[PDB]
Paper text:
Roseiflexus (R.) castenholzii is a chlorosome-less filamentous anoxygenic photosynthetic bacterium. It contains only one LH, which forms an unusual RC-LH complex. The 15 LHαβ heterodimers formed an opened elliptical ring surrounding the RC, which contained L, M, and cyt c subunits; the long and short axes were 112 Å and 103 Å, respectively, and a tetraheme binding domain of cyt c protruded into the periplasmic space. Each LHαβ non-covalently bound two B880s and one B800 BChl on the periplasmic and cytoplasmic sides.
Numbering used by the authors:
A (entry chain 6), M (entry chain E), N (entry chain G), P (entry chain I): 7 to 55
B (entry chain L): 6 to 18, 29 to 315
C (entry chain Y): 1 to 32
D (entry chain Z): 12 to 58
E (entry chain C): 161 to 267
F (entry chain P), H (entry chain R), I (entry chain T), J (entry chain A), K (entry chain J), L (entry chain D), ...: 4 to 41
G (entry chain M): 335 to 640
The structure:
């Protein structure tokens, strides 16, 4: 686990850090797409009124 | 020398002493470990009458049985003139009477018969607990019998008091408590659609299937040269799983209790809170996941 | 009253359910 | 007039008496076999 | 009979405070029935819905009869034991099974 | 000895008591004697 | 002459699959065994699997056709869809439209083939291991009841409409309709006999389980070893049931009792259901002539009205 | 000795008590004596 | 000694309590004394 | 070898028989060929 | 010997008794003889 | 050998019997031949 | 297996050859009877029409 | 199994040959009776028409 | 030997008795003979 | 099994021969009685018509 | 030998008996021969 | 090797057969092509 | 370590899929957006 | 390694197939595209 930073060594293995990075990047991209979609949907038809 | 095996087979040629049944009974029969022996310091009846054990709860139970049988036969031969057991009609008091009893009015002997039957059942349960304590055993048989006794108690005590009329009790007549069952099932129409009745039916069917499979499994390896692993290999080729020697009995016990428990819950709930099991399911088509998704005869 | 006694009988009905849950808990716990 | 029809006789009571007698006979024979003497572990030393 | 009462039909009996737009068979009362089902007013009602021990019908006719019977249950709100003795359905005992016949003929 | 004395006594007494109870109930339920309010 | 190791780890047809066993964990803690092990697939179990798959596929596709192929209405109404048999008109005929009972017949036929091949699989696998063939005959009794319900009752009545309708809700409806159409099903004597045997089966199962679990400290659950020399647990159980009700069995006869109770339940149910339609058209009207119906002149009807 | 003294005493007392209770209830419910409000 | 003193005391006390309860409930339910609202 | 000969034979024969039966039933229930009384 | 004497006696006696009872009841319920009040 | 002779014989006989019964039942139930009262 | 022909020796036992012959003869007889029955049924009432 | 013919020695025991003979005679008698009964039934009332 | 004598005797006797009962019942229920009140 | 004939020695014990004789005689008597009963019933009321 | 003689005999006898019973019932229930009251 | 060849073959063949059957049934039931009597 | 990485991944992904399907179905059935034929 | 490759591929393929099927049935059943007879 020599690639894990010092703070998170007692929790993360060396193979799980890469998967965690992939998951974090995927979640951030999904959040960006979701905010864009919600803005477009509100511009189309407001659901609050 | 021929040794008779417990299965009844005799084989030519370990602690396999062929011993009578008297020695086993004499070794294990010791006095003074029942429930009442702990409470009063002594069991008033701590003896055996033939093969039966007569404890403090055996006398109460026998009194209850005798009184119940006498009161049952009095109402059905006298006060009805039927003279046949298949056409007598032992009914509780009318619903207009309320929760109070009256010796002058009809339906009085139904009350005494029901009370005596309840006393006898409770005494039987306590006597089983006593006998289980005397043998250093577990308390599982009393648990099962208590489940069925609670099933009895729900129908004749709790439901009538909750409804509040005391005429809400099934008559104690052969081929006539079926009449009460049929009329109660149709007043709350589609008793099939009661969710807890279906669970009871499912557990009953599973109990029958499990019992028959266990009997077949045990009988199939009775009197052959087997390595004690053949039945597991059979049960793993078919169905791809074997449960083990101790797992099956636990399953049987648990299912047998659960079926009657769910049935008593369903009957009690049908008595008081719901009036129509068809209207109970009216919420399914109205949840906010399917409301506007259909058209014509297909929309609800 | 109409509802208090009914709720009490409901409690009594569930007290019947409890003993078998006790056996399940004993079987689960006592193995280890 | 007061008698049940023949179907009521046979279909209902032949099975009933058959069930009662068969139960009472099976109980007797099973108790006989269970009370018969055969190989048992000695209770004095087994436990 | 007079035991039912002297109640008589009037304008508010059907219209119930609505001039037009009166609707029989709303969505509320069509709970466990097909939504296209209607009361079968093509038959002869003194003996129209008899199914018990017929040997010329099957579960299809019994299903139609059960739909009609559940509609009757919902319309009155008294359950299936209001007009029947569940030990024998063809029986004429409870005395509201005849009033229902007069209602069927009137409808 | 084919039959022990104790079982003979028990069976005879039980049968006698059962028959006595049954006969009294059958006679009382017949309503042909005017006994206990006719 | 029978090797248990090859019976579990052969390969291909007349062999097993999922050979490396899996462990469930929680089943070990609660039931005592958690190994899933390999499963046999040779010959029998292939035909049955294929036929059951075909029948289920037909039923599910006909479910899909009834809602316009909408997957949301499918989920909403999945528990009350059913494929019904042909109506009473020209009932026994097979020249029915696919949406008026055409899909029911093929699925029923495939189900019949599936159950028969499953019985054959049970028989052959019981023979191949050295154990007896009691399970095959018990399943034969169950199949007797099944075939009375699905094949032999519709036939001899003249129409396919007398059979169930292949649905979650369509079997309860079938039971209710069959009870209503032939008078009162409570007064059918074989129904009473079957109820007797079913309740006895449940009672016996509960008693046997409770006893074997109560005397489990002395290893009474090893029934195969108890059938050679009886240890203290079986003696304690025998004494318990002797002192309670005056008579008892041993570790061998109780299984005979259970087997025969189940078999009698199935057989009596089948006989009663078959007689329900062909010989006696009205069970209540027959019970009145047989003197088993109690007179009810003046019932108190306030109990049954809201 | 065929029968213990204790068994005889217990059986006789139980039978007597059961008979007394049954007879009192049967006479009370017959309404033929005018006792306890007719 | 055929019967322990403790057994006799227990049986007598149980019978007395049960019968006293039974007589009180039976007299109360008969409605012939004008007690506890008639 | 990936597959036995017997497995292939069994699977192919079963599939063929099932498809033949299904096709015959579907064509019979369509009523478009005027076969077996139209 | 294919069959015990005892089993033959038991089966024959049971069959005869059942047949006699069944025939008597079937004749009695027919009302074709005028026996026991027509 | 891929298949036993016994397995082939049993499978073929069962299939033939089932097919014969099915074909007879479908031909009879169609009512297009005037056999056994039309 | 000396009665089996050379080509089918690895498949057939000596006792199964006779049963196979019996089955073949029965099948051919049944086929002839089926052909006759079918032609008679067609001469009676055509089913294709 | 000295009574069985030479052909059927691999299939038949010595006690089963007699039983098979009895069975074949019974089958032939039953077939003759069935043919006669069918002819009489047809002469009474034809079922084909 | 393929079949025991006892099995053959049992099967034949059971089949015969079942058939005798069945044909007497079927002949009775038809009402085509006028026996036992028509 | 010295009482059984030569042909049926492989099939019969010495005790089963007598029982078989008894059963055969009973069957023949029953057949004669049944034939007489059928003749009487047909003379009474023909069932075919 | 692929099949026992006893197995063949049992299977053939059972099939024959079942077929005979089924055919007799099917012919009787059709009402096309005027046998046993038409 | 992450996957056996036989598992891949079985899964692919089963999926293809199921998809073909489903597509044929859906297209037949749509009533848009005029196949098998419209 | 309190929680495996695999467990958290599985729970979070399953929750996301279920919530997404639920939210699309609730938005589609509300009829407020004019999507897929109003 | 937190996840096997085969588990991931199986889960992804099954999810993709289910989603594609669901989307095609949803688009077909809405009747907003005029496909397969409107
Ligand atoms: C109502 C008005 C709009 C609308 C409004 C919105 C809005 C607003 C949003 C979406 C979003 C999305 N919509 Mg929408 N949507 C509409 C109609 C549609 C239609 C259609 C047929 O018309 C489709 C196909 C979709 C589909 C989609 C998705 C692309 C997306 C949600 C993804 C998801 O499930 O995340 C949840 C899924 C998961 C948690 C599972 C992920 C699985 C991963 C990627 C695969 C892993 C495989 C591997 C083996 C796993 C290993 C670990 C395992 C545990 C072993 N919408 C209409 C037209 N939609 C959202 C979005 O943009 O998301 C990015 C969003 O915010
Ligand atoms: C219907 C017109 C007549 C009438 C017509 C007849 C005729 C006709 C006869 C009788 C007969 C009898 N009737 Mg009457 N009967 C009438 C009204 C009555 C009434 C009544 C309440 O009105 C009663 C109580 C009786 C009573 C009796 C019995 C005295 C007797 C049958 C005995 C019996 O049970 O034999 C059956 C009993 C047994 C086989 C067993 C008896 C018990 C044994 C002796 C006890 C042994 C105990 C020992 C421990 C056992 C060892 C073995 C154990 C298993 C361990 N009758 C009316 C008035 N009655 C019959 C008779 O006279 O018999 C002599 C007779 O034939
Ligand atoms: C009122 C008129 C009623 C009627 C009402 C009753 C009632 C009520 C009873 C009887 C009882 C009996 N009846 Mg009367 N009986 C009637 C007509 C009859 C006829 C008839 C042919 O006409 C007969 C033959 C009988 C016959 C009998 C006997 C079976 C019995 C009394 C004798 C006995 O056993 O004493 C033996 C009895 C004893 C030895 C009891 C001794 C008890 C001791 C004294 C202690 C009592 C309890 C004590 C106070 C408790 C507190 C102290 C503590 C113990 C320390 N009755 C009419 C119809 N009959 C009584 C009986 O005992 O039934 C079982 C009974 O209860
Ligand atoms: C109201 C008029 C009612 C009626 C109402 C009752 C009621 C109510 C009861 C009786 C009881 C009895 N009735 Mg009265 N009874 C009526 C008419 C009759 C007739 C009749 C033919 O008319 C008869 C024969 C009887 C006969 C009897 C006796 C069996 C008994 C009383 C004597 C006894 O044994 O005392 C023996 C009793 C004792 C020695 C008890 C001693 C208890 C000690 C003193 C302790 C008491 C508890 C104490 C206060 C607790 C707190 C302190 C702590 C202990 C430290 N009754 C009428 C119909 N009767 C009573 C009884 O005891 O029944 C079993 C009873 O409860
Ligand atoms: C419908 C017009 C006629 C009629 C038409 C006919 C005709 C026609 C015939 C009969 C026949 C008979 N009928 Mg009829 N029958 C009528 C009315 C009746 C009435 C009546 C109450 O009126 C009765 C009692 C009978 C009775 C009889 C029998 C005597 C006989 C059938 C015997 C049998 O069971 O064979 C089957 C029995 C067995 C297979 C076994 C019987 C028992 C054996 C002998 C005992 C062995 C015991 C030993 C221990 C067993 C060892 C092996 C065990 C396995 C251990 N019929 C009416 C009046 N009936 C038949 C006959 O004459 O037969 C000779 C016959 O063909
Ligand atoms: C009446 C006209 C009907 C019709 C009615 C029937 C009926 C009815 C049957 C067939 C059967 C068959 N039909 Mg056709 N059939 C029709 C039109 C067709 C058409 C067509 C496209 O038009 C075709 C292709 C077929 C094709 C077929 C074959 C699959 C089969 C006959 C050959 C066979 O396999 O023999 C192989 C079969 C054998 C060799 C059997 C051998 C049996 C041996 C000889 C023993 C017989 C039993 C014996 C007597 C029992 C007693 C003795 C004891 C055994 C000791 N039919 C029309 C619609 N068809 C028959 C069949 O076998 O279906 C499975 C069948 O039962
Ligand atoms: C339930 C039946 C009884 C029984 C009842 C009888 C009877 C009854 C008789 C015998 C006789 C015999 N039994 Mg024994 N027997 C039983 C058990 C056994 C057992 C055994 C279980 O081990 C054995 C080995 C035997 C063996 C024997 C022989 C020792 C003996 C002579 C047989 C013979 O030659 O028959 C060969 C002859 C026949 C088989 C005759 C068959 C007749 C057929 C049935 C036709 C009858 C026509 C009818 C009478 C005419 C009717 C006219 C009407 C008016 C219409 N029985 C069982 C328990 N047994 C007989 C005997 O000892 O005679 C001196 C005798 O009478
Ligand atoms: C009435 C005209 C009816 C009809 C009514 C019947 C009836 C009824 C039956 C048959 C049966 C058969 N039918 Mg036809 N059948 C009709 C038209 C047809 C047609 C046609 C295309 O039209 C065909 C092909 C057939 C073909 C057949 C055969 C499958 C079979 C007869 C041959 C056989 O196997 O004998 C072989 C049979 C045997 C070898 C039996 C031998 C039995 C021995 C002799 C013992 C008999 C019992 C004995 C008396 C018991 C007492 C003694 C004790 C045992 C000691 N039927 C029409 C529709 N058919 C019969 C059959 O056996 O079906 C299975 C049958 O029962
Ligand atoms: C017609 C217009 C419809 C519509 C109809 C459809 C249909 C129909 C489908 C989609 C699918 C999808 N839709 Mg769209 N969709 C609409 C509006 C939207 C909106 C929107 C907000 O408006 C969004 C965000 C989406 C989003 C999406 C995605 C979730 C997805 C396509 C991307 C993907 O995952 O590719 C990844 C896809 C792949 C990598 C597939 C690879 C397949 C390989 C090539 C093999 C295919 C099988 C092969 C031919 C088999 C035979 C050979 C053998 C293998 C040997 N849709 C409207 C309402 N949409 C598609 C999908 O995949 O859903 C799960 C789909 O099926
Ligand atoms: C009372 C005697 C009575 C009156 C008054 C009345 C009026 C009435 C009107 C004016 C209409 C038509 C109004 C419009 O244009 O639709 C109308 C229509 C219906 N009615 Fe009616 N009506 C009276 C009595 C009754 C009674 C007693 C019934 C019930 C049996 C009844 C029923 C109906 C129905 C149904 C209609 C159809 C109206 C609809 O919206 O479809 N009326 N009535
Ligand atoms: Fe067991």
């Amino acid at each position: 686990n020599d690639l894990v930073p010092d703070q998170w060594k007692p929790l993360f293995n060396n193979a799980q850090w890469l998967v965690h990075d992939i998951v974090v990047k995927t979640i951030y991209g999904g959040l960006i797409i979701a905010v864009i979609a919600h803005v477009l949907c509100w511009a189309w038809t407001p659901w609050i009124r | 020398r021929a040794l008779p095996l417990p299965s009844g087979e005799t084989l030519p040629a370990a602690s396999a002493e062929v011993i009578p049944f008297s020695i086993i009974e004499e070794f294990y029969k010791r006095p003074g470990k029942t429930l009442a022996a702990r409470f009063f310091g002594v069991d008033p009846f701590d003896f055996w009458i033939g093969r039966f054990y007569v404890g403090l709860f055996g006398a109460i139970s026998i009194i209850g049985i005798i009184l119940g049988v006498a009161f049952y036969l009095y109402e059905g031969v006298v006060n009805e003139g039927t003279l046949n057991i298949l056409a007598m009609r032992i009914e509780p008091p009318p619903v207009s009477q309320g929760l109070n009893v009256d010796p002058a009015q009809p339906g009085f002997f139904w009350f005494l018969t029901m009370v005596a039957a309840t006393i006898a059942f409770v005494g039987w349960l306590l006597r089983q607990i006593d006998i289980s304590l005397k043998l250093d055993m577990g308390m599982e048989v009393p648990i099962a019998f208590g489940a069925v006794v609670s099933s009895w108690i729900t129908l004749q005590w709790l439901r009538p008091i909750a409804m509040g009329a005391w005429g809400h009790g099934f008559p104690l007549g052969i081929t006539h408590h079926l009449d009460w069952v049929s009329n109660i099932g149709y007043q709350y129409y589609n008793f099939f659609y009661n969710p807890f009745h279906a669970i009871g039916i499912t557990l009953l069917f599973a109990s029958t299937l499990f019992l028959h499979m266990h009997g077949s499994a045990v009988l199939s390896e009775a009197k052959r040269n087997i390595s004690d692993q053949n039945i597991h290999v059979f049960w793993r080729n078919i169905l791809g799983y074997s449960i083990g020697e101790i797992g099956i009995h636990r399953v049987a016990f648990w299912t047998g209790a659960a079926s009657v428990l769910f049935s008593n819950l369903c009957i009690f709930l049908s008595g008081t809170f719901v009036k129509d099991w068809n209207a109970f399911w009216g919420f399914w088509d109205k949840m906010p996941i399917w409301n506007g998704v259909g058209q014509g005869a297909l929309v609800a | 009253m109409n509802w208090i006694v009914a709720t009490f009988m409901l409690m009594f009905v569930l007290v019947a359910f409890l003993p078998l849950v006790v056996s399940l808990a004993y079987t689960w716990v006592t193995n280890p | 007039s007061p008698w049940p029809v023949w179907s009521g006789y046979a279909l209902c009571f032949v099975p009933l008496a058959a069930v009662i007698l068969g139960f009472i006979i099976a109980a007797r024979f099973t108790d006989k076999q269970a009370t018969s003497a055969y190989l048992r572990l000695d209770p004095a030393k087994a436990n | 009979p007079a035991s039912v009462g002297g109640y008589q039909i009037t304008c508010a009996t059907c219209h119930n405070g609505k001039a037009a737009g009166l609707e029989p068979y709303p969505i509320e009362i069509m709970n466990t029935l097909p939504n296209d089902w209607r009361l079968p007013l093509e038959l002869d009602y003194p003996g129209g819905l008899v199914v018990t021990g017929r040997k010329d019908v099957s579960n299809h006719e019994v299903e139609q009869n059960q739909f009609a019977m559940y509609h009757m249950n919902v319309s009155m709100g008294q359950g299936c034991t209001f007009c029947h003795n569940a030990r024998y359905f063809p029986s004429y005992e409870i005395a509201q099974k005849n009033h229902s016949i007069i209602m069927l003929q009137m409808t | 000895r084919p039959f022990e004395f104790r079982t003979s006594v028990v069976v005879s007494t039980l049968l006698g008591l059962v028959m006595a109870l049954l006969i009294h109930f059958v006679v009382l339920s017949s309503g042909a004697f005017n006994w206990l309010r006719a | 002459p029978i090797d248990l190791h090859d019976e579990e780890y052969r390969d291909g047809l007349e062999g097993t699959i999922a050979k490396p066993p899996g462990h469930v964990g929680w089943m070990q803690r609660l039931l005592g065994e958690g190994q899933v092990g390999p499963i046999y697939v040779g010959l029998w179990g292939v035909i049955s699997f294929i036929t059951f798959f075909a029948s289920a596929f037909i039923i599910l596709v006909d479910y899909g056709r009834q809602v316009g192929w909408n997957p949301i209405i499918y989920l909403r109404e999945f528990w009350n869809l059913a494929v019904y048999p042909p109506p009473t008109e020209y009932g026994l005929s097979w020249n029915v439209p696919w949406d008026k009972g055409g899909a029911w017949l093929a699925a029923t036929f495939f189900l019949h083939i599936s159950v028969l091949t499953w019985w054959a699989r049970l028989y052959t696998r019981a023979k191949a291991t050295g154990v007896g063939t009691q399970l095959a005959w018990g399943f034969a009794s169950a199949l007797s009841l099944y075939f009375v319900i699905y094949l032999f009752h519709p036939l001899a009545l003249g129409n396919w409409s007398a059979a169930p309708g292949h649905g979650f809700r369509a079997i309860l409806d079938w039971t209710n309709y069959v009870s209503i159409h032939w008078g009162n099903f409570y007064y059918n004597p074989f129904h009473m006999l079957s109820i007797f045997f079913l309740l006895g089966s449940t009672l016996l199962l509960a008693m046997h389980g409770a006893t074997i679990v109560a005397t489990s400290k002395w290893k009474s659950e090893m029934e195969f070893t108890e059938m050679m020399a009886e240890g203290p647990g079986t003696q304690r159980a025998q004494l318990f049931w002797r002192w309670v009700m005056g008579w008892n069995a041993n570790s061998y006869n109780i299984h005979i009792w259970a087997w025969w109770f189940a078999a009698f339940t199935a057989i009596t149910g089948a006989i009663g259901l078959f007689l329900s339609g062909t010989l006696v058209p009205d069970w209540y009207a027959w019970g009145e002539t047989a003197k088993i119906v109690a007179p009810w002149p003046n019932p108190d009807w306030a109990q049954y009205v809201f």
